[PDB]
Design a protein around this ligand. Structure first.
Ligand SMILES: *C(=O)/C=C/c1ccc(O)cc1
Length: 125
């Protein structure tokens, strides 16, 4: 395992050193998005939570394509506000229910240290 906790204060610094293989070592789901919501990275823990195969969703748009249940003010709305403002750090619970058994998670969205990409971190609750 990679030794970093969900919701860590400096998580964007710690994850700046991870290629796909190291992200796969996290204890929680990690998705990196560009400012439009396109998936840049998607780790193994996330695939275990939601069933998606990482290489099949990278390059897709998370809000339009992969996760329409997140296309709402309560999720995408927060994301887009953060992309627009150029800062994002929000944690909230949510239920993922598209083509899957509804699964309650805790989500932490945080702007990456890199200028315009955004993490979506997920763990079960
Ligand atoms: C709602 O449509 C949620 C979908 C979803 C969330 C997270 C994933 O890893 C994959 C799909």
């Amino acid at each position: 395992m990679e030794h970093v906790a969900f919701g860590s204060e400096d998580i964007e610094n710690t994850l700046a050193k991870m290629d796909d293989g190291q992200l796969d070592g996290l204890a929680f789901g990690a998705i990196q998005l560009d400012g439009d919501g396109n998936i840049l990275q998607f780790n193994a823990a996330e695939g275990d939570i939601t069933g998606r195969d990482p290489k099949q969703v990278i390059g897709k748009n998370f809000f339009k394509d992969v996760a329409p249940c997140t296309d709402s003010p309560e999720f995408y709305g927060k994301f887009k506000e953060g992309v627009a403002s150029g800062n994002l750090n929000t944690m909230f619970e949510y239920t993922f229910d598209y083509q899957m058994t509804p699964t309650k998670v805790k989500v932490h969205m945080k702007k990456a240290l890199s200028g315009d990409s955004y993490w979506v971190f997920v763990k079960r609750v």
